[PDB]
Amino acid sequence: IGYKLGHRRALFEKRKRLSDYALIFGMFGIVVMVIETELSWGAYDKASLYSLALKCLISLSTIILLGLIIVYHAREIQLFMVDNGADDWRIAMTYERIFFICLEILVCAIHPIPGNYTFTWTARLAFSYAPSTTTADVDIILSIPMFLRLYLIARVMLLHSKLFTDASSRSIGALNKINFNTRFVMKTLMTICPGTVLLVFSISLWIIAAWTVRACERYHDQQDVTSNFLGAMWLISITFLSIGYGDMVPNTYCGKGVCLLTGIMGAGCTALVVAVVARKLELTKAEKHVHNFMMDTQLTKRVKNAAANVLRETWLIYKNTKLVKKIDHAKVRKHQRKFLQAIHQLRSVKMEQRKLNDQAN
Amino acid sequence: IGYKLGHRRALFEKRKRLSDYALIFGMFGIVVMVIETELSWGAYDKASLYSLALKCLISLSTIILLGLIIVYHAREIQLFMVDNGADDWRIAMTYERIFFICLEILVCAIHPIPGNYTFTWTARLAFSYAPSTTTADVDIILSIPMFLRLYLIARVMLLHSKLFTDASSRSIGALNKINFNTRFVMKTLMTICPGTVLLVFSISLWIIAAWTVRACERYHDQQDVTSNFLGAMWLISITFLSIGYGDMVPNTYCGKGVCLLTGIMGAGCTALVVAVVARKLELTKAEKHVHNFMMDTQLTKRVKNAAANVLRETWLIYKNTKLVKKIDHAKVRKHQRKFLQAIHQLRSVKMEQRKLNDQAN
Amino acid sequence: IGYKLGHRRALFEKRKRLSDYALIFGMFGIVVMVIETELSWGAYDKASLYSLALKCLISLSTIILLGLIIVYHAREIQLFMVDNGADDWRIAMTYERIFFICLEILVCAIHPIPGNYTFTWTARLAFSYAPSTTTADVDIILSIPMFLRLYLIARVMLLHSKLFTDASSRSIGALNKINFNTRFVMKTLMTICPGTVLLVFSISLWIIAAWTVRACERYHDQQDVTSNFLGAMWLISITFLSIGYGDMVPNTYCGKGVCLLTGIMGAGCTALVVAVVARKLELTKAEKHVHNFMMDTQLTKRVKNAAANVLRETWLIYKNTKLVKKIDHAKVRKHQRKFLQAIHQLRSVKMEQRKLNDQAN
Amino acid sequence: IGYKLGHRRALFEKRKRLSDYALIFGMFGIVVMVIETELSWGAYDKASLYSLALKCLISLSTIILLGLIIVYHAREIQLFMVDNGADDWRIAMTYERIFFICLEILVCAIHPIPGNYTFTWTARLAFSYAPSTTTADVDIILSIPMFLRLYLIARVMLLHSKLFTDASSRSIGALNKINFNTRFVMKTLMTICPGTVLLVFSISLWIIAAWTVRACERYHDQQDVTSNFLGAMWLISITFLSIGYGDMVPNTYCGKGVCLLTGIMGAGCTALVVAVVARKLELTKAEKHVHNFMMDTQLTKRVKNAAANVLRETWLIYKNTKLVKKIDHAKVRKHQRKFLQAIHQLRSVKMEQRKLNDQAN
Amino acid sequence: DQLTEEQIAEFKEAFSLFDKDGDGTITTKELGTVMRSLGQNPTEAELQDMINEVDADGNGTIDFPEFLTMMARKMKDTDSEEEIREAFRVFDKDGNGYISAAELRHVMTNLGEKLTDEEVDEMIREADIDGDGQVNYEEFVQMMTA
Amino acid sequence: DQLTEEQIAEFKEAFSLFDKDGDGTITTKELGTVMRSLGQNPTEAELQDMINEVDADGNGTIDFPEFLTMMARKMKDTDSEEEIREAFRVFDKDGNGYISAAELRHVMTNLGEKLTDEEVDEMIREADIDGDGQVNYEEFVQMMTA
Amino acid sequence: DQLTEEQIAEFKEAFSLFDKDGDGTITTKELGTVMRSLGQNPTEAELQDMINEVDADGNGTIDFPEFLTMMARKMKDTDSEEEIREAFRVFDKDGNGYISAAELRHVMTNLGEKLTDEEVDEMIREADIDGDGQVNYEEFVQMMTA
Amino acid sequence: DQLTEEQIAEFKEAFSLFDKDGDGTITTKELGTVMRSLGQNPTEAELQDMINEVDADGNGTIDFPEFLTMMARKMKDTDSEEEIREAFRVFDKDGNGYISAAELRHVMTNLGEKLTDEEVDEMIREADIDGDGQVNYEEFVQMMTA
Ligand SMILES: [Ca+2]
Numbered sequence A, B, C, D: 001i002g003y004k005l006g007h008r009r010a011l012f013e014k015r016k017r018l019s020d021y022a023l024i025f026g027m028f029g030i031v032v033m034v035i036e037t038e039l040s041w042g043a044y045d046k047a048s049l050y051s052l053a054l055k056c057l058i059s060l061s062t063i064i065l066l067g068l069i070i071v072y073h074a075r076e077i078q079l080f081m082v083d084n085g086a087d088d089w090r091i092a093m094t095y096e097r098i099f100f101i102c103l104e105i106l107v108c109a110i111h112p113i114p115g116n117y118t119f120t121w122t123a124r125l126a127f128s129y130a131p132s133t134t135t136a137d138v139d140i141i142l143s144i145p146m147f148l149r150l151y152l153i154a155r156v157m158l159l160h161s162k163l164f165t166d167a168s169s170r171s172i173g174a175l176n177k178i179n180f181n182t183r184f185v186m187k188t189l190m191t192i193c194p195g196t197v198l199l200v201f202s203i204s205l206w207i208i209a210a211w212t213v214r215a216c217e218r219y220h221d222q223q224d225v226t227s228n229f230l231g232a233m234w235l236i237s238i239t240f241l242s243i244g245y246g247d248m249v250p251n252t253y254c255g256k257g258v259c260l261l262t263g264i265m266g267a268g269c270t271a272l273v274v275a276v277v278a279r280k281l282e283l284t285k286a287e288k289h290v291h292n293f294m295m296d297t298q299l300t301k302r303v304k305n306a307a308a309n310v311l312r313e314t315w316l317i318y319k320n321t322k323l324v325k326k327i328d329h330a331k332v333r334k335h336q337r338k339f340l341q342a343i344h345q346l347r348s349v350k351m352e353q354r355k356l357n358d359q360a361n
Numbered sequence E, F, G, H: 001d002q003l004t005e006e007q008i009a010e011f012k013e014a015f016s017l018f019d020k021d022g023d024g025t026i027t028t029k030e031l032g033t034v035m036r037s038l039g040q041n042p043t044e045a046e047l048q049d050m051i052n053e054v055d056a057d058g059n060g061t062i063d064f065p066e067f068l069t070m071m072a073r074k075m076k077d078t079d080s081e082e083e084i085r086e087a088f089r090v091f092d093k094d095g096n097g098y099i100s101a102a103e104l105r106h107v108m109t110n111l112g113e114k115l116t117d118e119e120v121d122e123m124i125r126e127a128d129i130d131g132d133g134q135v136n137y138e139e140f141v142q143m144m145t146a
């Protein structure tokens, strides 16, 4: 053919390659921020050379990330112009494509800048209602929002899907008018592998939320309660399951927000788990047939065994009544009791077998 | 036709207009009450001209609301007489109609009257069991019940629905004998838009309950715990999800009632969400067919790949046993292990293929 | 037939009549016990004449109740002998009928006897872990178990069921081999009236559990926390929903056991409510058909409306390109954007129409 | 074929016999450990002869258990060689069979050795945040892990299953290609007896978890709160249902881990119970048919009863209007009201009848 | 205020459903199509009788002027001239509409509110349109005369 | 006692569920009507045999006195002289009814409580009512003689 | 660029899905096999018309060169030469393909954004290629002539 | 190392599952009876072929000695003499069995673990039983000769 399916291949490769460097430069800044935040508490201070040197490596990565995002959007514009018949870049701007670019820029543009700035922080302590005031730095405000950079992982995972760039899949979708969207992958995954995504999401949320809670609570905790990493892990775990708080109520609002988010996520995951358990218990045809066969055999055997005793007790009663002159009534009444028990057992087994048979028909 | 249809439209319009002014005059009083209650705490006192002037604007609105309600009921009586063929108006008075008019009058007749009245209030504090006594005003008792005026919104929403005032649907409703009731709209909405009503109801309940809890708790709270608006929001949110109370137990009974109501509503909403999630995970026919097609293709490819290795390992064993005289037994043992692994894998893939095929038939 | 069908009527009436006096004499003792327990705390003491006089009225009722139970069992024995062919009363004794008679006697034989006896009680207080020791009376031990007498209400309700004594129902059950046991009524009720039994059971449990908790907690509470009736009601309500305890943890094992039972009952009721909500929201055929009809009409109208705009924009572009010499490109690109939007909307509406149609087929 | 089938019987019997002595020697050590741990607290000390004598009986049992495990694995190797065509024991070692043997050895090799060793333990107290330091023994660390020896019960139960060693079921398994693996038994059990395994598992977990919690909490509890056996039982029960902690938060990580595990198990059991309740409420065909029959009869009777009143009221109106000259309008109004009520009731009953008839098909 | 511009057009939308392409003609074939999609498969005589009653022109189909009259009676909450018909057809013997005089005595003295013998005796003596003991429809129209 | 006036209508109400239009008889066509609504589709012989046993009059249909007697036995919790036949029909081949005498020897040795050989040896004595080795139910009626 | 060796094998895998027995031919019977497994039971004319358009050799079957061309159209996110056809076929009558010129006046003046009378008058006078009042798709081809 | 009395009775219970009339053998018509209850509806040839292999007497029915030998194969966890059959039948067309020798060249080289040309070259030169290009299962029995 030429051009088409030859040039379109190059655009796909360029778009796919540009989404990995962005992820690398997005994770590098997060890692450096975590190390700097951990080491700036006791190892050194904010007025040293280590802090400036280690925070000057975040701005460069942010600039590279912004450049990569802009190039990615330009290549997407080129692909859109190639796909639909058009010869002007101005046609794509539709008051919605512009907004998401600005949203991405604002989300990925936040980082702790070099310097030494401070502000005043006041909070009310739990279980005692006592005021507390400290002097904090503005870097804590500018570092937590950088966890929003995790949306790139979804894009990288989607662009690498085999069911996204397969010609046969496209042909079948055309034959069935299937809408291959960014959400259909989740719908398929919640069926093919419904027990792996839940575990991965739970562990990631657990670790990130515990670290964030401890980072908030370091400032106003002097008794090592909510500022301990294992304590934060336990608090997140018990809030996820909605058991309670114990004596681990935070003294800060950003801990309360994390706890509320964890509770909402836990409720949603519990509903999903209930649905999955309901869906995972029904039997297939083969095992059902085998079960019916074995049950029918067992019930037939039990029916014969129960039917023997009725005749046995009848014969015992008849032999013991009109024979050997005098009769001992104790044996007679015992045999009558056994006869009634045998009758009831036979009736019950017959009813159960007929019910099972009509159900299995 | 004439009087049958020409006049029937005028009555509907008159009844519809009378339901909007009632809503406006019902919301005006609530807004004025909220502003007056907020401003009577610290700005001025209950013995000033501002309080009297601002509370004299609620009685007039209440009187107008009562007049509008009476006119609406009279027009409904007129419509009922027209729609049945009766002549005397006394025929419509059937107790059940009389009781609801009085109920509406009593519900909408409550408001804080002008004046300056007080009473004595006592309570037991939480976590300390200490008595507390203050002097309060009777306006707090007469203002909270005015939130019952919100039933007018349902009437306004119902009277504006096209599915209730469309003459085309009447033929199908008569054909299928379906009851167009005031409740059918809810059941339809819980299917067409099951995720919007839940959000709207949750946000409205959240804000109203938080404001009411703070209004109760401001009287006996001296440490800014349960009288803080954000604290009330957090308490309502954590009681809705049934996680616990922490150190946020109210010292008043009207806070406990709100918490109990929030818990009941939360349980009901959780059940509804579970049902919705259960009903939202089913797959349609086209996607199911496409999934089956792709799975069959992949499984066939895997079957061929697994079947090749059996022959490969058999040939390797045969070449390594009866050739080049001396033989290394380690190679033979390794090849036998690989042969058994290939056999087991082929059997598993064949079983999965047959199971998928029979279940998809 | 008169010897069988006429005589069998008398035994049924005698058995039915004997189950109402038993209930009356079982409720009389409970009421008297509640009044005496309430009035013996502050009104008088256990060494007065009022206490002896009011407790001497429980033993007589207990004796009458035991006599009525024995007569009821004798009449049931007579009915069993009449029904199944037998002429010896000893045949019915089967090591299981004997055990239940003794169980009933032991359950209904417990009551607070007259006298004045005491014992020593020690408990650990909540939130403070401080020991507490009081001198109590043995009447508290002998009064709470009398709430087990409520099993008679089930018997009275069952014996009055219309579907239990009716020839037509018996004939149909014999034809269909169904079992009319003491459990089928519950399953039928959970379908015909699934929302009334839950409410009745919840209210009865609420009141009885609150009274029992307050009665157990009277002895070791000196701050009016868990000994207040409204506080007990609130604690029972919040334990039923599994929200928490707040500051209302009992200092006695009696309250702990009552709370555990309430939590188990609450979990069971929540599961039942979830199942009922799941089984309620499904639609019937008529409403489904009318909904499909209205949806089809609306989608057809929307299809026509969307299809008009494509032609409108195509004509606008064609008129604006090759006419009136010079052309303003801004208008052209605006119309191209509108053309693409119209195309996308039309495609979406067509897809939704086809999906709904194939689903409704 | 006599050689293969005759020899295969001996290996199965040898393998089955070796799994009972292992269980006996695994339970003996647990029992002795529990007795020694209970008696080493107050009766004697770790520097006595009773402790050495009673702990020297655990090492011998552990050695016997290890020998039995090794012999069992050797016999399993022999069975595998007999089953699949092979003449060398080295073929079975596949890097996975080796790993599980080592895992079993490490799990079953842990026990408290004789001697007298100590270490230092520090914890933070609940609700007070006060440090606590004691000196403990290393035997507490080496005794709790021995509860992992309970996996032998599953093996013993599986090897005794009739549906696992039945020659008749092999034909049906071949005909249906159903997998008789170690997981199918649970699937069958969760259907045949879904209410017994839950109870057994709940009681076992309850007792073991309460004992473990008390065993760890004995060291840092001086007020008899979390070191009391009944208190531990109540804490485990209320954590299982996810109600809260009250004032029973542990001062040790043992309690935190055990409570987390109990909460997870409780959530899973609640989901299973919800599914079972949903599965246990649908009706069978016979009872459904009987119910429909009775409902139809009752509805027909109600239809006739309602239809009589319309004619009755019409006749009353006609007699009271054009007769006896003068008329009283009050009677006319009352009769017209009754006429409308009868019409509405008849319409409602007809609608219910037609809906039931349309549904029951 | 009858031929209002918006309300007449609205009736066209409702009338367009039963109009196949462009003809003010509603026949037996049209009813089968619409009723099939509504879960109804009535017999041929059913809709034949249905279209017959709502027919005034006599051409074997339904006209637009006839559509207004039938719609007006369906918009009304309760048709008092059809409820008595329902109470008769529930007691209908086979379908001829003939109910014996002696039958009415039992269904009135026992079923319902237990009307007195004297009252029903006056009822039947006046209900005798001819004197044979069978009333079909004249009693109902005689009831609603004024 | 016998049957009181309020009890008279009780059975007629139940009898009316099988008497549709004042038939006064219970025929095969009406029996098949109610059985289909109860999830049963038996063969013609089954319903023919069912009405054959309860046809005391001999006219080929069930009468009310016949209906009263048969339903009275159904009110019993256990019909004593009916389960023995059911046990016999369990050990029955192709509906012949002639159970081989030698067959009873095996079933009594192991099936049940394992009666002794000498016990069944005396049991087979007097079991042969004629001396061939086949018994249909003459042993059963002999069992319930007194 | 054109197509690389890896890309060539990719189409073969998709090509092999319509060649159960090879032969490099896509016959009518092969389409029926795949469509039934995809929840479709179309008529013979539908598949006959479908293969007719995608056939350029003229033999009757489809080869790879025709297969390659039809895939490129599918890969496009929006075929601008088909949407106008679908809009015409929405208002199309009985598959004729020739729409009345007078009908377009109503659908343009009211349906949609209510185009003005003067502009739609210019539309029809330019679309009067027929000269009598029955326009067709011949307006579409001149719409996309440049 | 024998079959004890318990073992003998054990197989009879399994054997009684197929001997409905106690004939001492199984008829080919009752195979479909048990298979229908197991959700299987095979053709006549399938059941004819199945009984053909396990028929040693040659009369047309299966005896107990064949049944006893049948269970022994079922007891084995992996019958190594049938897995190669499965692999061959995967690469089999129209059930001929005459697998082309040139076809095996491609699959071994690419499909699987990528065997080399020199390795596969010795396979055909040894698998040529005659030298025409068609190979059969005689290669398999040659593989398992020792
Ligand atoms: Ca027509």
Ligand SMILES: [Ca+2]
Residues within 6 Å of the ligand: E057, E058, E059, E060, E061, E062, E063
């Ligand atoms: Ca007409």
Ligand SMILES: [Ca+2]
Residues within 6 Å of the ligand: F023, F024, F025, F026, F027, F028, F030, F061
């Ligand atoms: Ca009859």
Ligand SMILES: [Ca+2]
Residues within 6 Å of the ligand: F054, F055, F056, F057, F058, F059, F060, F061, F062, F063, F066
């Ligand atoms: Ca008869």
Ligand SMILES: [Ca+2]
Residues within 6 Å of the ligand: G021, G022, G023, G025, G026, G027, G030
């Ligand atoms: Ca072909």
Ligand SMILES: [Ca+2]
Residues within 6 Å of the ligand: G055, G056, G057, G058, G059, G060, G061, G062, G063
């Ligand atoms: Ca071709």
Ligand SMILES: [Ca+2]
Residues within 6 Å of the ligand: H018, H019, H020, H021, H022, H023, H024, H025, H026, H027
């Ligand atoms: Ca046979």
Ligand SMILES: [Ca+2]
Residues within 6 Å of the ligand: H025, H056, H057, H058, H059, H060, H061, H062, H063
């Ligand atoms: Ca044979």
Ligand SMILES: [K+]
Residues within 6 Å of the ligand: A274, B274, C274, D274
């Ligand atoms: K739930």
Ligand SMILES: [K+]
Residues within 6 Å of the ligand: A242, A243, B242, B243, C242, C243, D242, D243
């Ligand atoms: K909870």
Ligand SMILES: [K+]
Residues within 6 Å of the ligand: A242, A243, A244, B242, B243, B244, C242, C243, C244, D242, D243, D244
């Ligand atoms: K909780």
Ligand SMILES: [K+]
Residues within 6 Å of the ligand: A243, A244, A245, B243, B244, B245, C243, C244, C245, D243, D244, D245
């Ligand atoms: K809690």
